[PDB]
Amino acid sequence: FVIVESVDPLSGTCMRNTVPCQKRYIKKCCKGFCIDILKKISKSVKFTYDLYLVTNGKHGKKINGTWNGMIGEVVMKRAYMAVGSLTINEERSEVVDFSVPFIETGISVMVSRSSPSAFLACVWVMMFVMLLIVSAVAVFVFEFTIGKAIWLLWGLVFNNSVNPKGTTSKIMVSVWAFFAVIFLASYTANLAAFMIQEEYVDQVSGLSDKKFQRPNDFSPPFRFGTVPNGSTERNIRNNYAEMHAYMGKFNQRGVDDALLSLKTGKLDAFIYDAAVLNYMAGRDEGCKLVTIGSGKVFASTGYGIAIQKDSGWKRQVDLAILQLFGDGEMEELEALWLTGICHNEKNEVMSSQLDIDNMAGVFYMLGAAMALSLITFISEHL
Amino acid sequence: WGLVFNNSVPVQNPKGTTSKIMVSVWAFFAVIFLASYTANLAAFMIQEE
Amino acid sequence: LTINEERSEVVDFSVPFIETGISVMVSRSNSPSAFLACVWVM
Amino acid sequence: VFASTGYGIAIQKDSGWKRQVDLAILQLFGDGEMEELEALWLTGICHNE
Amino acid sequence: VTIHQEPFVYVKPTMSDGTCKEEFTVNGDPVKKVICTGPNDTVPQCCYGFCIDLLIKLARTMQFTYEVHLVADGKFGTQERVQNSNKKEWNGMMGELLSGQADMIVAPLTINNERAQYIEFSKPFKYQGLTILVKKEIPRSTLDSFMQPFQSTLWLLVGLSVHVVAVMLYLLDRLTLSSAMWFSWGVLLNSGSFSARILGMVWAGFAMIIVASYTANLAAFLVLDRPEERITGINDPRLRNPSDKFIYATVKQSSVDIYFRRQVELSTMYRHMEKHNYESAAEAIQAVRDNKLHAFIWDSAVLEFEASQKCDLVTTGELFFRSGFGIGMRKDSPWKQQVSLSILKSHENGFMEDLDKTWVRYQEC
Amino acid sequence: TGELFFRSGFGIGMRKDSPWKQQVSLSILKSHENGFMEDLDKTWVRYQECDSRSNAPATLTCENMAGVFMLVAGGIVAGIFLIFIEIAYKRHKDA
Amino acid sequence: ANLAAFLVLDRPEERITGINDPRLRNPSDKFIYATVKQSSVDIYFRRQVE
């Protein structure tokens, strides 16, 4: 969303289109393509624009009985117009003038995935049908032996691996031989099916989840959260009480530093701005983490910069935005910033790994069916 | 060598008790060898030119 | 039109606006058995 | 590559713009907008290259 | 004159005394060679190259005594501002041509809108390319298969489980019970009471889907992500994102490097290229062997020759700053226009693909 | 379709200034604050009418394969007929 | 391998590339792509260069 640096020590100066600012007050390089969007804005706006550093507190928020922060800095009226992208906040909105969206945003917590047996319907219809034809051939044996023959051809049902003397009945079995042959083809076929085209999930349920709506109710802690004075988290103060409750263990510092915690993964995910989220997607070390859910909308909103309540450029400033989306060059703003790096906004990549207990689920599904056969065997004893 | 393709030789398995598992060596071995066959089946099955 | 040495020798020809070459292109309507070494060693 | 060459337009032998015209080409590839010329024409449709 | 470039030429010291090793081709011809004095890093040295070959056939069109020189500095040439008198000055081969130190320059350098007001040249001796040197990442994918990537715990777990199922079989029995090593486990390997027979079908489909699982494992062994190579395009984000994570650049004082040196959007990029620049394209192949940077950039077709040089490297995406090569031409030349004609005839004849036989057509990897 | 084109949204028509203007905007803000949005998805959007595929999860494949499998069943009935005719052939052939 | 054909297969693309999408960018009578008369986004087309 925002870039900065030191001015060029050789020349002691800014580069690119960058307009720097002082730091107390010492000039330091101020950068970033959204601020740039503000620049191209001021262009047709023709409004003298001189950068400043932020004093403290990242964005603005209520402090004690008052507010202290960027928005608060605006409330201080120490500046004509704001710089930096902070979410539209109804509270902050009620405070003073907020601009129109420069870009959309939302609440999100994104993470990584470090399978549901579907290999294991009407196939069974073909099975019982094959039992019917099995009866037919059992009749064909006229001109255990007939009864367990169902188990004989049924041997093919898995790779044969268990024969009647019927000469015509032999080819009658051969029916099940080619049939079950292509049925093995069906098995390896579904093996291709799951073998290709997987999806899975980390199953994010949103603000509320098993791991969220009843987070303490599970065995491990699943930590999804943000840093001090989270704006979207301020919405979470409204969203859920247990949220801000568990937020204590969820305590974390730094944004990119939080991404580092993701590299550690000591927490479930990191609640943050969905815009900032996707940002965290594009810039990364490699492909590990994934969006909060798919990036499904959670607390639809946007961030941006603004000016004092009832300011000069206000309407016309919004019009400047109207130009901004007008030319379509905002696409080129992605090209300046939001353009995709990690990409992968759709494809599921590869889950390739060995088998796991998830694979073992079907194994259990048969192993218990054995016990079912034991109960029915006691019924045979009855 | 019957295993070399899917077993399927009607003829007279040997009666050796230890020799049985000795065959079982070729059973798992040739099993994953079938895995090798279907594996190359994946190979050509993917990535053609 | 392609730079043609003949035509080039004729009169002034510009520099390349874009590259070109001789070609004849087609389709494949309907593989070399490679399913069928050290495997045999095993 | 078969018979590496190119097509295009030109003028009479020893014409006015000649050198400078080539220079105009130098601009043409200069800005890189020839990529945008693909975007005007040569851009891929069938892709699958 | 030129600089030794394996894509362009094979240039090494002379053999013993004024000696050049005589060797036929891979196709068996003993292609010609030449010699040029120069420094090795001012001494007599040897000259051989498919480019140099194009000089050979070139004079073979218009007879002229072939003289071969080296390049004092490393670069090709560039208009350059001095520390005094404030005059932009082409350098090197360009400068040496302004110096006229040789008849006509020969090298695989691009016609530059820069070089325009400096010098002229004919149509491309070949259609060439320039892009970012791409380094191949190490694929592995190897496995012991059902050994390696199959159910690390469950490989044995389901097995002893099957031993327990065998205990259920012997239960159905109550040796024949002791025969379960053959019956149930034999069912597993498929290696050769009507109530329990159902359980027969049970361990049966069980192993069926098990082998199936091994097949899926084969699919893992083949199909797999092996994630992308980056190297997107002129807009490539990795290149477009200033940081210290990755290193992508080209050598100092190069023609395409100048294609960066006059730019708008590339600003931060070429800025990085300042601290990231290198000297020799050979030094680029070297730093690649070292995997020194994250990425490099040079003449693209040349980099295809580098693909012939080593497998540790990759082919970049597509065309960047389409250009080509030719003969150095200062003002007008007595050999100028007819020389261009010679190029034309070169395109007409197969001496091009023949040059591929000299170098390009060789498939190394 | 592919991706975003001309990012935009919806709202309430406002002419010049409105007595309900700014506070109405506030109402929107509160709307974003509350879940009435996702509730509106419940009104319409959240309803999932159809699936979304990429590949062809046919792993069932059954009713499709019914021609080949049931075709094998045809081989079975053919087993009845040809086994009866051939049954007379070898049976009476021994007679 | 036949099963692999039954699963893996091309099923070629959907076109619909982007604002630069060639099919849309290539005037002809082959394909028909448009929006309704007198619409807002239609106006987003009505003021344009490319």
UniProtKB/Swiss-Prot annotation, chain C:
Glycans are attached at residue 30. It is found in: Cell membrane; Postsynaptic cell membrane; Late endosome; Lysosome. Phosphorylated on tyrosine residues. It comes from the Eukaryota. Expressed in the hippocampus including the dentate gyrus (at protein level). Detected in adult olfactory bulb, brain cortex, hippocampus, striatum, thalamus, superior colliculus, with much lower levels in inferior colliculus, midbrain and cerebellum. Coiled coil: none annotated. L-glutamate binds at residues 2, 7. The extracellular N-terminal domain (ATD/NTD) endows NMDARs with a unique capacity for allosteric modulation, harboring several binding sites for small molecule ligands that act as subunit-specific allosteric modulators of ion channel activity. Belongs to the glutamate-gated ion channel (TC 1.A.10.1) family. NR2B/GRIN2B subfamily. Heterotetramer. Forms heterotetrameric channels composed of two GluN1/zeta subunits (GRIN1), and two identical GluN2/epsilon subunits (GRIN2A, GRIN2B, GRIN2C or GRIN2D) or GluN3 subunits (GRIN3A or GRIN3B) (in vitro). Can also form heterotetrameric channels that contain at least two GluN1 subunits and at least two different GluN2 subunits (or a combination of one GluN2 and one GluN3 subunits) (in vitro). In vivo, the subunit composition may depend on the expression levels of the different subunits. Found in a complex with GRIN1, GRIN3A and PPP2CB. Found in a complex with GRIN1 and GRIN3B. Component of N-methyl-D-aspartate (NMDA) receptors (NMDARs) that function as heterotetrameric, ligand-gated cation channels with high calcium permeability and voltage-dependent block by Mg(2+). Participates in synaptic plasticity for learning and memory formation by contributing to the long-term depression (LTD) of hippocampus membrane currents. Channel activation requires binding of the neurotransmitter L-glutamate to the GluN2 subunit, glycine or D-serine binding to the GluN1 subunit, plus membrane depolarization to eliminate channel inhibition by Mg(2+). This is Glutamate receptor ionotropic, NMDA 2B. It comes from Rattus norvegicus (Rat). The lineage of its organism: Eukaryota, Metazoa, Chordata, Craniata, Vertebrata.
Swiss-Prot record, chain F:
It comes from the Eukaryota. Detected throughout the brain, in brain cortex, cerebellum, thalamus and olfactory bulb. NMDA is probably regulated by C-terminal phosphorylation of an isoform of NR1 by PKC. Its phosphorylated state is influenced by the formation of the NMDAR-PPP2CB complex and the NMDAR channel activity. The chain crosses the membrane at residues 65-85. It is found in: Cell membrane; Postsynaptic cell membrane; Synaptic cell membrane; Postsynaptic density membrane. Glycans are attached at residue 23. Heterotetramer; the NMDAR subunits are modular and harbor tiered domains that function in concert to regulate opening and closing of the cation-selective ion channel pore. Forms heterotetrameric channels composed of two GluN1/zeta subunits (GRIN1), and two identical GluN2/epsilon subunits (GRIN2A, GRIN2B, GRIN2C or GRIN2D) or GluN3 subunits (GRIN3A or GRIN3B) (in vitro). Can also form heterotetrameric channels that contain at least two GluN1 subunits and at least two different GluN2 subunits (or a combination of one GluN2 and one GluN3 subunits) (in vitro). Belongs to the glutamate-gated ion channel (TC 1.A.10.1) family. NR1/GRIN1 subfamily. Component of N-methyl-D-aspartate (NMDA) receptors (NMDARs) that function as heterotetrameric, ligand-gated cation channels with high calcium permeability and voltage-dependent block by Mg(2+). NMDARs participate in synaptic plasticity for learning and memory formation by contributing to the long-term potentiation (LTP). Channel activation requires binding of the neurotransmitter L-glutamate to the GluN2 subunit, glycine or D-serine binding to the GluN1 subunit, plus membrane depolarization to eliminate channel inhibition by Mg(2+). A hydrophobic region that gives rise to the prediction of a transmembrane span does not cross the membrane, but is part of a discontinuously helical region that dips into the membrane and is probably part of the pore and of the selectivity filter. The extracellular N-terminal domain (ATD) is a site of allosteric regulation to modulate overall receptor function. This is Glutamate receptor ionotropic, NMDA 1.
